[PDB]
PDB file of N, CA, C and O in Angstrom:
ATOM      1  N   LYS A 240    -119.505-141.581 -30.133  1.00 19.45           N
ATOM      2  CA  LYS A 240    -119.385-140.459 -31.068  1.00 19.45           C
ATOM      3  C   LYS A 240    -117.949-140.134 -31.307  1.00 19.45           C
ATOM      4  O   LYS A 240    -117.062-140.899 -30.948  1.00 19.45           O
ATOM      5  N   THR A 241    -117.726-139.030 -31.927  1.00 21.95           N
ATOM      6  CA  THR A 241    -116.419-138.551 -32.180  1.00 21.95           C
ATOM      7  C   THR A 241    -116.165-137.281 -31.384  1.00 21.95           C
ATOM      8  O   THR A 241    -117.029-136.407 -31.274  1.00 21.95           O
ATOM      9  N   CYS A 242    -115.033-137.224 -30.795  1.00 21.26           N
ATOM     10  CA  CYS A 242    -114.579-136.089 -30.057  1.00 21.26           C
ATOM     11  C   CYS A 242    -113.340-135.600 -30.779  1.00 21.26           C
ATOM     12  O   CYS A 242    -112.608-136.420 -31.346  1.00 21.26           O
ATOM     13  N   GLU A 243    -113.105-134.315 -30.819  1.00 19.59           N
ATOM     14  CA  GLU A 243    -112.037-133.810 -31.633  1.00 19.59           C
ATOM     15  C   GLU A 243    -111.282-132.722 -30.902  1.00 19.59           C
ATOM     16  O   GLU A 243    -111.889-131.805 -30.334  1.00 19.59           O
ATOM     17  N   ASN A 244    -109.979-132.812 -30.924  1.00 17.87           N
ATOM     18  CA  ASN A 244    -109.125-131.870 -30.229  1.00 17.87           C
ATOM     19  C   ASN A 244    -107.888-131.681 -31.063  1.00 17.87           C
ATOM     20  O   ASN A 244    -107.641-132.455 -31.969  1.00 17.87           O
ATOM     21  N   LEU A 245    -107.140-130.670 -30.762  1.00 19.88           N
ATOM     22  CA  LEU A 245    -105.985-130.299 -31.499  1.00 19.88           C
ATOM     23  C   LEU A 245    -104.886-131.338 -31.411  1.00 19.88           C
ATOM     24  O   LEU A 245    -104.714-131.994 -30.377  1.00 19.88           O
ATOM     25  N   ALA A 246    -104.154-131.479 -32.488  1.00 17.86           N
ATOM     26  CA  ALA A 246    -103.003-132.331 -32.515  1.00 17.86           C
ATOM     27  C   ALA A 246    -101.940-131.718 -31.625  1.00 17.86           C
ATOM     28  O   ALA A 246    -101.563-130.545 -31.807  1.00 17.86           O
ATOM     29  N   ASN A 247    -101.447-132.499 -30.704  1.00 20.45           N
ATOM     30  CA  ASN A 247    -100.550-132.016 -29.673  1.00 20.45           C
ATOM     31  C   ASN A 247     -99.187-131.776 -30.222  1.00 20.45           C
ATOM     32  O   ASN A 247     -98.587-130.725 -29.986  1.00 20.45           O
ATOM     33  N   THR A 248     -98.714-132.711 -30.989  1.00 19.99           N
ATOM     34  CA  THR A 248     -97.375-132.658 -31.493  1.00 19.99           C
ATOM     35  C   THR A 248     -97.287-132.068 -32.893  1.00 19.99           C
ATOM     36  O   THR A 248     -96.281-132.218 -33.579  1.00 19.99           O
ATOM     37  N   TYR A 249     -98.326-131.386 -33.310  1.00 19.45           N
ATOM     38  CA  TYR A 249     -98.311-130.734 -34.596  1.00 19.45           C
ATOM     39  C   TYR A 249     -98.106-129.254 -34.370  1.00 19.45           C
ATOM     40  O   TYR A 249     -99.043-128.525 -33.992  1.00 19.45           O
ATOM     41  N   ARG A 250     -96.890-128.832 -34.528  1.00 17.11           N
ATOM     42  CA  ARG A 250     -96.535-127.458 -34.328  1.00 17.11           C
ATOM     43  C   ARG A 250     -96.387-126.767 -35.667  1.00 17.11           C
ATOM     44  O   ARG A 250     -95.455-127.057 -36.429  1.00 17.11           O
ATOM     45  N   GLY A 251     -97.323-125.917 -35.966  1.00 17.14           N
ATOM     46  CA  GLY A 251     -97.307-125.166 -37.185  1.00 17.14           C
ATOM     47  C   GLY A 251     -98.689-125.133 -37.779  1.00 17.14           C
ATOM     48  O   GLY A 251     -99.593-125.788 -37.242  1.00 17.14           O
ATOM     49  N   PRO A 252     -98.923-124.356 -38.841  1.00 18.52           N
ATOM     50  CA  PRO A 252    -100.213-124.330 -39.513  1.00 18.52           C
ATOM     51  C   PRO A 252    -100.420-125.578 -40.366  1.00 18.52           C
ATOM     52  O   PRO A 252     -99.460-126.225 -40.809  1.00 18.52           O
ATOM     53  N   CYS A 253    -101.643-125.913 -40.572  1.00 18.49           N
ATOM     54  CA  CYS A 253    -102.016-127.038 -41.363  1.00 18.49           C
ATOM     55  C   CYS A 253    -102.591-126.544 -42.667  1.00 18.49           C
ATOM     56  O   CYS A 253    -103.292-125.524 -42.694  1.00 18.49           O
ATOM     57  N   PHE A 254    -102.286-127.233 -43.747  1.00 15.76           N
ATOM     58  CA  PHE A 254    -102.769-126.820 -45.042  1.00 15.76           C
ATOM     59  C   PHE A 254    -103.567-127.931 -45.740  1.00 15.76           C
ATOM     60  O   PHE A 254    -104.343-127.662 -46.656  1.00 15.76           O
ATOM     61  N   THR A 255    -103.385-129.174 -45.323  1.00 15.77           N
ATOM     62  CA  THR A 255    -104.061-130.300 -45.952  1.00 15.77           C
ATOM     63  C   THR A 255    -104.434-131.374 -44.897  1.00 15.77           C
ATOM     64  O   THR A 255    -103.634-131.679 -43.996  1.00 15.77           O
ATOM     65  N   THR A 256    -105.634-131.939 -45.015  1.00 13.66           N
ATOM     66  CA  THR A 256    -106.116-132.965 -44.103  1.00 13.66           C
ATOM     67  C   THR A 256    -105.235-134.220 -44.117  1.00 13.66           C
ATOM     68  O   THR A 256    -104.965-134.780 -43.070  1.00 13.66           O
ATOM     69  N   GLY A 257    -104.731-134.599 -45.285  1.00 15.68           N
ATOM     70  CA  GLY A 257    -103.842-135.759 -45.394  1.00 15.68           C
ATOM     71  C   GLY A 257    -102.596-135.644 -44.511  1.00 15.68           C
ATOM     72  O   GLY A 257    -102.082-136.655 -44.007  1.00 15.68           O
ATOM     73  N   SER A 258    -102.148-134.416 -44.282  1.00 14.45           N
ATOM     74  CA  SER A 258    -100.983-134.163 -43.469  1.00 14.45           C
ATOM     75  C   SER A 258    -101.360-134.342 -42.001  1.00 14.45           C
ATOM     76  O   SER A 258    -100.647-134.987 -41.222  1.00 14.45           O
ATOM     77  N   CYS A 259    -102.511-133.800 -41.659  1.00 13.70           N
ATOM     78  CA  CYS A 259    -103.029-133.840 -40.311  1.00 13.70           C
ATOM     79  C   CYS A 259    -103.418-135.268 -39.919  1.00 13.70           C
ATOM     80  O   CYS A 259    -103.040-135.760 -38.857  1.00 13.70           O
ATOM     81  N   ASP A 260    -104.124-135.941 -40.810  1.00 13.47           N
ATOM     82  CA  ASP A 260    -104.630-137.280 -40.558  1.00 13.47           C
ATOM     83  C   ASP A 260    -103.513-138.271 -40.351  1.00 13.47           C
ATOM     84  O   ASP A 260    -103.598-139.118 -39.461  1.00 13.47           O
ATOM     85  N   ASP A 261    -102.438-138.148 -41.139  1.00 14.86           N
ATOM     86  CA  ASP A 261    -101.290-139.043 -40.965  1.00 14.86           C
ATOM     87  C   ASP A 261    -100.703-138.820 -39.613  1.00 14.86           C
ATOM     88  O   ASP A 261    -100.421-139.749 -38.894  1.00 14.86           O
ATOM     89  N   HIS A 262    -100.602-137.569 -39.248  1.00 15.60           N
ATOM     90  CA  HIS A 262    -100.087-137.187 -37.963  1.00 15.60           C
ATOM     91  C   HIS A 262    -100.925-137.796 -36.833  1.00 15.60           C
ATOM     92  O   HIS A 262    -100.390-138.408 -35.910  1.00 15.60           O
ATOM     93  N   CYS A 263    -102.208-137.642 -36.918  1.00 14.98           N
ATOM     94  CA  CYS A 263    -103.089-138.126 -35.890  1.00 14.98           C
ATOM     95  C   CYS A 263    -103.151-139.657 -35.846  1.00 14.98           C
ATOM     96  O   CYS A 263    -103.217-140.220 -34.785  1.00 14.98           O
ATOM     97  N   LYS A 264    -103.108-140.323 -36.990  1.00 12.59           N
ATOM     98  CA  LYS A 264    -103.130-141.761 -37.033  1.00 12.59           C
ATOM     99  C   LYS A 264    -101.772-142.364 -36.686  1.00 12.59           C
ATOM    100  O   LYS A 264    -101.637-143.133 -35.739  1.00 12.59           O
ATOM    101  N   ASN A 265    -100.788-141.996 -37.450  1.00 12.49           N
ATOM    102  CA  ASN A 265     -99.448-142.545 -37.382  1.00 12.49           C
ATOM    103  C   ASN A 265     -98.680-142.079 -36.143  1.00 12.49           C
ATOM    104  O   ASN A 265     -98.065-142.895 -35.457  1.00 12.49           O
ATOM    105  N   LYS A 266     -98.744-140.799 -35.820  1.00 13.93           N
ATOM    106  CA  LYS A 266     -97.983-140.309 -34.681  1.00 13.93           C
ATOM    107  C   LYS A 266     -98.803-140.304 -33.398  1.00 13.93           C
ATOM    108  O   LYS A 266     -98.352-140.805 -32.385  1.00 13.93           O
ATOM    109  N   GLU A 267    -100.016-139.777 -33.437  1.00 15.08           N
ATOM    110  CA  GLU A 267    -100.792-139.656 -32.199  1.00 15.08           C
ATOM    111  C   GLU A 267    -101.724-140.830 -31.944  1.00 15.08           C
ATOM    112  O   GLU A 267    -102.332-140.931 -30.880  1.00 15.08           O
ATOM    113  N   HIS A 268    -101.810-141.704 -32.926  1.00 15.23           N
ATOM    114  CA  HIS A 268    -102.598-142.940 -32.874  1.00 15.23           C
ATOM    115  C   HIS A 268    -104.061-142.748 -32.497  1.00 15.23           C
ATOM    116  O   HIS A 268    -104.611-143.481 -31.663  1.00 15.23           O
ATOM    117  N   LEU A 269    -104.676-141.776 -33.109  1.00 14.88           N
ATOM    118  CA  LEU A 269    -106.080-141.523 -32.934  1.00 14.88           C
ATOM    119  C   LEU A 269    -106.827-141.879 -34.222  1.00 14.88           C
ATOM    120  O   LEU A 269    -106.226-142.435 -35.153  1.00 14.88           O
ATOM    121  N   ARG A 270    -108.108-141.547 -34.281  1.00 17.90           N
ATOM    122  CA  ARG A 270    -108.988-141.954 -35.380  1.00 17.90           C
ATOM    123  C   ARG A 270    -108.568-141.325 -36.690  1.00 17.90           C
ATOM    124  O   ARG A 270    -108.122-141.997 -37.621  1.00 17.90           O
ATOM    125  N   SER A 271    -108.705-140.046 -36.749  1.00 17.47           N
ATOM    126  CA  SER A 271    -108.490-139.313 -37.945  1.00 17.47           C
ATOM    127  C   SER A 271    -107.882-138.007 -37.566  1.00 17.47           C
ATOM    128  O   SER A 271    -107.708-137.726 -36.375  1.00 17.47           O
ATOM    129  N   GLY A 272    -107.567-137.242 -38.536  1.00 18.89           N
ATOM    130  CA  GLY A 272    -107.090-135.930 -38.327  1.00 18.89           C
ATOM    131  C   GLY A 272    -107.591-135.068 -39.422  1.00 18.89           C
ATOM    132  O   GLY A 272    -107.604-135.485 -40.584  1.00 18.89           O
ATOM    133  N   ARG A 273    -108.052-133.918 -39.085  1.00 12.08           N
ATOM    134  CA  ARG A 273    -108.582-133.009 -40.050  1.00 12.08           C
ATOM    135  C   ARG A 273    -107.990-131.680 -39.960  1.00 12.08           C
ATOM    136  O   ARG A 273    -107.677-131.167 -38.882  1.00 12.08           O
ATOM    137  N   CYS A 274    -107.850-131.121 -41.093  1.00 14.31           N
ATOM    138  CA  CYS A 274    -107.313-129.830 -41.225  1.00 14.31           C
ATOM    139  C   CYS A 274    -108.489-128.921 -41.330  1.00 14.31           C
ATOM    140  O   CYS A 274    -109.198-128.911 -42.351  1.00 14.31           O
ATOM    141  N   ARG A 275    -108.770-128.231 -40.276  1.00  9.89           N
ATOM    142  CA  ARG A 275    -109.982-127.483 -40.232  1.00  9.89           C
ATOM    143  C   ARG A 275    -109.801-126.041 -40.651  1.00  9.89           C
ATOM    144  O   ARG A 275    -108.688-125.604 -40.960  1.00  9.89           O
ATOM    145  N   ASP A 276    -110.906-125.312 -40.653  1.00 10.15           N
ATOM    146  CA  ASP A 276    -110.981-123.906 -41.095  1.00 10.15           C
ATOM    147  C   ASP A 276    -110.082-122.998 -40.269  1.00 10.15           C
ATOM    148  O   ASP A 276    -109.601-121.976 -40.738  1.00 10.15           O
ATOM    149  N   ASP A 277    -109.839-123.414 -39.059  1.00 14.54           N
ATOM    150  CA  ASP A 277    -109.015-122.689 -38.101  1.00 14.54           C
ATOM    151  C   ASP A 277    -107.507-122.916 -38.343  1.00 14.54           C
ATOM    152  O   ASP A 277    -106.657-122.453 -37.567  1.00 14.54           O
ATOM    153  N   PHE A 278    -107.195-123.642 -39.416  1.00 16.06           N
ATOM    154  CA  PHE A 278    -105.820-123.875 -39.911  1.00 16.06           C
ATOM    155  C   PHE A 278    -104.966-124.763 -39.018  1.00 16.06           C
ATOM    156  O   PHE A 278    -103.761-124.879 -39.240  1.00 16.06           O
ATOM    157  N   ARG A 279    -105.544-125.391 -38.034  1.00 17.82           N
ATOM    158  CA  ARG A 279    -104.782-126.302 -37.229  1.00 17.82           C
ATOM    159  C   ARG A 279    -105.236-127.722 -37.450  1.00 17.82           C
ATOM    160  O   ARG A 279    -106.283-127.975 -38.066  1.00 17.82           O
ATOM    161  N   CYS A 280    -104.426-128.630 -37.004  1.00 16.42           N
ATOM    162  CA  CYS A 280    -104.686-130.029 -37.110  1.00 16.42           C
ATOM    163  C   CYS A 280    -105.470-130.486 -35.906  1.00 16.42           C
ATOM    164  O   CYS A 280    -105.061-130.254 -34.761  1.00 16.42           O
ATOM    165  N   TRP A 281    -106.590-131.075 -36.159  1.00 18.00           N
ATOM    166  CA  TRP A 281    -107.444-131.602 -35.138  1.00 18.00           C
ATOM    167  C   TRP A 281    -107.538-133.089 -35.311  1.00 18.00           C
ATOM    168  O   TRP A 281    -107.852-133.564 -36.399  1.00 18.00           O
ATOM    169  N   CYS A 282    -107.282-133.806 -34.279  1.00 19.60           N
ATOM    170  CA  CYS A 282    -107.359-135.229 -34.317  1.00 19.60           C
ATOM    171  C   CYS A 282    -108.726-135.655 -33.818  1.00 19.60           C
ATOM    172  O   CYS A 282    -109.196-135.176 -32.769  1.00 19.60           O
ATOM    173  N   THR A 283    -109.360-136.535 -34.535  1.00 16.57           N
ATOM    174  CA  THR A 283    -110.642-136.997 -34.186  1.00 16.57           C
ATOM    175  C   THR A 283    -110.418-138.269 -33.387  1.00 16.57           C
ATOM    176  O   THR A 283    -109.508-139.036 -33.710  1.00 16.57           O
ATOM    177  N   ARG A 284    -111.160-138.472 -32.347  1.00 17.97           N
ATOM    178  CA  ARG A 284    -111.055-139.683 -31.581  1.00 17.97           C
ATOM    179  C   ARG A 284    -112.429-140.172 -31.194  1.00 17.97           C
ATOM    180  O   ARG A 284    -113.344-139.374 -30.981  1.00 17.97           O
ATOM    181  N   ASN A 285    -112.585-141.463 -31.167  1.00 19.75           N
ATOM    182  CA  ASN A 285    -113.813-142.089 -30.827  1.00 19.75           C
ATOM    183  C   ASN A 285    -114.106-141.977 -29.347  1.00 19.75           C
ATOM    184  O   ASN A 285    -113.226-142.193 -28.512  1.00 19.75           O
ATOM    185  N   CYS A 286    -115.314-141.618 -29.036  1.00 23.30           N
ATOM    186  CA  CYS A 286    -115.771-141.523 -27.692  1.00 23.30           C
ATOM    187  C   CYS A 286    -117.192-142.092 -27.622  1.00 23.30           C
ATOM    188  O   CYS A 286    -118.185-141.348 -27.795  1.00 23.30           O
TER     189      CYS A 286
END
């Protein structure tokens, strides 16, 4: 399944999933990244 937790190295509010996802893929090397309702970047990872 997918497990999802906050982006560690993303300091600040998130406004767009594309910003979060790049961060999670490119920087944190996880599955995806989503900019959720809670305004933070959550990186999705396979589990």
